[PDB]
Amino acid sequence: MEYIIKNGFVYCPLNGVDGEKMDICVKDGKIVESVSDSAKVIDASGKIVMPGGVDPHSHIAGAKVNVGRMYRPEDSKRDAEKFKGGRAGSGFSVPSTFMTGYRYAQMGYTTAMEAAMPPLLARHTHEEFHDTPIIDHAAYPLFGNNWFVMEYLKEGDVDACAAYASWLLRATKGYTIKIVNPAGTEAWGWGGNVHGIYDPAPYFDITPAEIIKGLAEVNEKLQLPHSIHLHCNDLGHPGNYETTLASFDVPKNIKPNPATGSRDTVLYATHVQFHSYGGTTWRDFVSEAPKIADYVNKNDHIVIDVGQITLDETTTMTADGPMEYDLHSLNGLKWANCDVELETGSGVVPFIYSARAPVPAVQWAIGMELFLLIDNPEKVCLTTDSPNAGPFTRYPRVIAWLMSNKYRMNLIEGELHKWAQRKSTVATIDREYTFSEIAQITRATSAKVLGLSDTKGHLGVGADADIAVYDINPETVDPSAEYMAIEEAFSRAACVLKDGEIVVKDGEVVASPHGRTYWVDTQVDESIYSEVLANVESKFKQYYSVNFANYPVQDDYLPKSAPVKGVML
Amino acid sequence: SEIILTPKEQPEVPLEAPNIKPDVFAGKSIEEIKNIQIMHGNEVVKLGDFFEVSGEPADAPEDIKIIIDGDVYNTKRIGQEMTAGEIIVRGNVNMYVGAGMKGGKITVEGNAGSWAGQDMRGGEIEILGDAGDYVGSSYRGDWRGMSGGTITVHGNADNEIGEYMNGGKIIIKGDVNIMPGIHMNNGLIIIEGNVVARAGGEMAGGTIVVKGMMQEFLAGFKYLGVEKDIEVDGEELPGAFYKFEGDHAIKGAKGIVYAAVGCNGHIA
Amino acid sequence: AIGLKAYPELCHGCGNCVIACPVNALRSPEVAGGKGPTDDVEIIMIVEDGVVNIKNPDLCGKCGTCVESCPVDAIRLEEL
Amino acid sequence: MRVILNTGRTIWQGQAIESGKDLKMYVDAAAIIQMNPEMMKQLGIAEGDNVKVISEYGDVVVKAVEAKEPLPEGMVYIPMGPWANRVIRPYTDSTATPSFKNIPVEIIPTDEEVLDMPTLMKVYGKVGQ
Amino acid sequence: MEYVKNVVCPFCGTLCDDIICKVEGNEIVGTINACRIGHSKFVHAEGAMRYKKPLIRKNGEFVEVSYDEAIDKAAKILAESKRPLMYGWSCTECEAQAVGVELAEEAGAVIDNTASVCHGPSVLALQDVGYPICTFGEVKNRADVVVYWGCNPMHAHPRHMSRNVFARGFFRERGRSDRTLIVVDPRKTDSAKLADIHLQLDFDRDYELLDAMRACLLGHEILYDEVAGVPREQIEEAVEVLKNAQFGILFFGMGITHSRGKHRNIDTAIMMVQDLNDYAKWTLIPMRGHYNVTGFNQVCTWESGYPYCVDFSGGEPRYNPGETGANDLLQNREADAMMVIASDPGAHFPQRALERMAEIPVIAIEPHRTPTTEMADIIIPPAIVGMEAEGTAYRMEGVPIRMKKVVDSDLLSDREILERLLEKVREYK
């Protein structure tokens, strides 16, 4: 079909367009230079036009997500819906799959990544994707506690690890090398953990630092579109900021080498809010986001996302098994766990981030400090580690917070515990994000660092026709004073197109197409590959609980396979 | 003041009628009340389709007294989330009567089904007949349940009365089955009759008084002795009670079971 | 002589004997790890058509481990 | 005699249901009551004799069988199936799950015949529609 | 004869995927590695009725109809129904379960699986206190202590012990000799006969025994000198066995979901396993029955937010087990129609529910002759998942494995039957 999007204020940071009024032309799911005079018109007068949002880190599809759904029926009773055109759903903090896709779409997001897939459970993730409307998607298989990875990397055999990874990304139909609490989750298999990046796991005797370094080497040896995706050790502990900065340095001198896309960074650090803590106990707990932000400013090898607290009752779900048990120990709330043989672990705990409480107050401040003290938006992405710090439905409120120091001070001076002022510097920061910087952290940075900026994250010719129109007029409305108009406008887009077809109009979902599944296609020396596959099959016979032939994901689970090539021949 | 609903023949497929409460009836003519929506299975219908309606309107829910002059054993959720006024049922009700109640009073002159007063916040519920399971309980998965109000069952109740209670007061004048006060955090349960088993299973706080006989009890409770002349939550109880603290299967448990000495020597 | 004898009519097909057997374990890593053999192997007994089935009685060393593992006395060491 | 009725699985009843619940095999595997030999003696019955089981909720005729999995004193075992489900406790206590296990029943010898599978269902009196 | 390897067995929640099928012609005539039950499903037993065409009851007598006629009348019944029950699901594959969810949505029905008569109480329990589990491979390679609590795997999961206990694992290379095996059951079951410790406790008193164990675990004194028929001093000795584990696994089953307390028996069991993790790594796995009961609770959860007992009457999903459960609707006479698929409630519901099945239209998507077909008005035979039809199933601890199609069938698959049933139901509405 043909569409012309007329007279909108276009924000496209990758093509350097900053609020220029400009028409966008669309033809057969692509953005093109011109269309016929018979093209149907979408009036964007007095409205903002952006590329479809691109979420680089969310928990939306898989086993740990569905445990959060299944064991929180009270969360569904809180927010249950049936829009009569579409499928029923429920779940405030962990929504069902159909509800999930609808709501990304309603807020103008068209691509969202599942950030933690246990390889043995990969069929589950892909089955939930099929029932997730609209959004294009991908899944990050986990590597930081993998038995093959730990065995190969200790022997210094990085090529064999790269052959294993090549096999695993193809077998799970995965997209990035995700590292969560490296070595620590394997230590949790016996009820323990690792402390700092030089503390080895039981038996395997390899450090987090060596796991991070080896997998970064593997990542660029396989020329993957995205970098290693790192969830640090010592998450959520007072004083952990030093473990974080030490982790950030480990892969710095590894040079990026994507075969697809424009990524120029070797490290992606996720939900860094949780890794920016000072003090030594919760009683002297203090923000260290300035030192963290200062590291990012001075370094050119790192991209981060924040993991912003939204001050809600939400659900936490992570592959960081030992950390969730500690969290259950503190708040006493229901606790789920799943250790996956030879591969990973996981935990699920509800958490109430009450604005009244001192610790969540400081946690909210830390994320704001990270957003506002980092100078270059090209180094940061907007995330809530959904749902860990809050549901993704609250990205507009995060946007509103960043665009308005009025909104922030209203919350700081009333409702937020005093500790937000005493134990951080948020109150002294009056910086406000512009509409251009918002599009950068919600579209461009993520699209670029994921290796998709050829087709995603921009409104230029050649891009996919993933487009969001927000009913807000930047010439006429003041984002600082009218922060509730910013929040409401980014929640319910006036028009959303997904591959050239209208899928949302005035906040209403009007179509339910299936999105593509991006995965990574890599080729490795056939000789090393065979040897590794012989070794892999031997342990399956001995130590796995399934048969090797039944393990990889069959093609029936990817109706819309969209391979992306890394290293070839 | 008085609005009369006379039930027609009740259907085998039950009705759900949350909108039968003073808050909705307020400010409505008799004709508008007949047109209130209720559910009949998977069909939306009108209250008039199953009830004759007479009486005089009123503008404020405080002044409205709904009396259901007939058996409504197959209607659920009557008085759900009512804040003020009064409901009288001259017969039996189904599940969820007064669920989510914030204020006012409901009197059921016959039996009530399960989840009577579920998630109660305030007000009063009185059931002259028997009640089902989960009197004053929480909802599935939630650890925060009933926080206020008073429920009085003159007959017997069944299982898990006061599940996850966190405030309020339940009084069972008859007998209960098993697990009264399961997962209790706060509040008061008084069982004037007997208990089959597991009174206070996994309670963390609150108070359970049993004036009859507990056939079985639980090894996670520490016996503290006998207390006389007990004052709890504004109610004075005469006689002596064996005093237990638990359930110490739970960390930091401070709950209290009082069991009357006359019929509970085997529990000590 | 004392030898291996199967009572398939009492057998559950549960596989404890097949996995417990050290001759089976040494010869098939899948059996050692608790799986039924999928690759072709010559071992003493397997579960076939739902019941225990002796294939190579000459390899049996009459140690008694399988018998200990069978709760329903479906595999035995007795005369002939 | 007052006894405690317990119900559940047996491989023979598992084999039977996947062979066919219309088969004679299924009556033999599921229309039985397992008893300790000492209880059979006290009741004056032998293996193959029939037993009438009566509870608050129903009644059924089953074939007495010597338990090879020993039972606690006073307990009997009927495998899961429609015979066992004539007599166990239906109420779910607002959980949706009936009380299939550990139900007080009365057992007495009987010369009546065990009902086969389609005949047993006729007592519920299915009306067509 | 041809040998098809790596077949997944469609019976119990062990979901063994190393079955070899022997195929003669287009027929499966034998198996390797499958146990006595699994073998019985794969192979045809002589004299057993396998419906080859749909049937309808004309009062008294069944008459063969076409697929379109049977699905036709089935759609009428659900469209006209004001409280239809769509029950079963556990013995078909996930893609059919997904269609069923959409169809229950379209008909304003209550959809429910065998969890409501099975590990439902574990679902209620895990919703309240949590769910600390692991996969089979962590048990095989790490487990130091293995407990079977109120389950009899020798008869109900026959290969479960051989794969998880007798197996030689990475850190347990001596298999059975490296593990302390505990069984808790009022009977001396064949599973109990293999145990190192058998708690032969009093029936209906697990909740009391678990209350003593946890109080002991947290340092408190056990009030009475005997609990659930077990002497005080062994409660303490058993608590010491669990505390000294390097890796413990609690497998539990119907002896604890069906017993007095039901979901609260699971509740206290879960919380003990949780608290033990301050002394020793501990985890639990429910011994879920059918090969894909777990899959339905997965599919229904992710599509709707709730795992079972899901009622779409109001459009949005609502969830109240005890109100919205199959046996609740039947025994309270709420259901005015019921559709059965891949389940046999005629054989396996209590008397009180069957009496209601006698009064209402019952549709049965069923390949074999059962007590449910004897109570059925419409019978629609399908291709059998795992033998004649493929699809995803979920093992008892959540591991997804794709069921294989081994031989061909002229009959329609469940998924296709349900997609046609849904198309017509919309025509009606």
Ligand SMILES: Nc1nc2c(c(=O)[nH]1)N[C@H]1C(S)=C(S)[C@@H](COP(=O)(O)OP(=O)(O)OC[C@H]3O[C@@H](n4cnc5c(=O)[nH]c(N)nc54)[C@H](O)[C@@H]3O)O[C@H]1N2
């Ligand atoms: N042969 C066969 N196998 C099957 C099935 C089948 O029908 N037949 N169905 C499958 C299904 S659906 C399921 S759910 C699983 C079920 O597998 P299991 O969980 O083993 O179910 P059951 O065999 O019914 O009961 C287990 C044990 O609980 C014991 N028990 C009874 N009362 C009590 C008590 O108060 N406390 C304790 N601790 N134990 C008690 C009984 O003695 C019984 O041995 O099996 C699956 N496999």
Ligand SMILES: Nc1nc2c(c(=O)[nH]1)N[C@H]1C(S)=C(S)[C@@H](COP(=O)(O)OP(=O)(O)OC[C@H]3O[C@@H](n4cnc5c(=O)[nH]c(N)nc54)[C@H](O)[C@@H]3O)O[C@H]1N2
């Ligand atoms: N007294 C007592 N009663 C009980 C129990 C107990 O322990 N004691 N246990 C309870 C429990 S846990 C359960 S789960 C139930 C048993 O639950 P049920 O679901 O009744 O188990 P089955 O009787 O095996 O029924 C499965 C049916 O699915 C059919 N089938 C097989 N493959 C396919 C397929 O591909 N498609 C379709 N459509 N159908 C197929 C089979 O022919 C069979 O009729 O019994 C319950 N009732």
Ligand code: SF4
């Ligand atoms: S023999 Fe005893 S053990 Fe070996 S299988 Fe037949 S039953 Fe299981």
Ligand code: SF4
């Ligand atoms: S006897 Fe010793 S050897 Fe011969 S089989 Fe049984 S186990 Fe293997």
Ligand code: SF4
């Ligand atoms: S075990 Fe459960 S699954 Fe593995 S075979 Fe015997 S039955 Fe089929």
Ligand SMILES: [K+]
């Ligand atoms: K949910």
Ligand SMILES: [K+]
């Ligand atoms: K404040």
Ligand SMILES: [K+]
């Ligand atoms: K068969």
Ligand SMILES: [Mg+2]
């Ligand atoms: Mg609850």
Ligand code: NA
């Ligand atoms: Na990891």
Ligand SMILES: [S]
């Ligand atoms: S099941």
Ligand SMILES: [W+6]
């Ligand atoms: W079951």
Ligand SMILES: [Zn+2]
């Ligand atoms: Zn993370």
Ligand SMILES: [Zn+2]
């Ligand atoms: Zn995350």
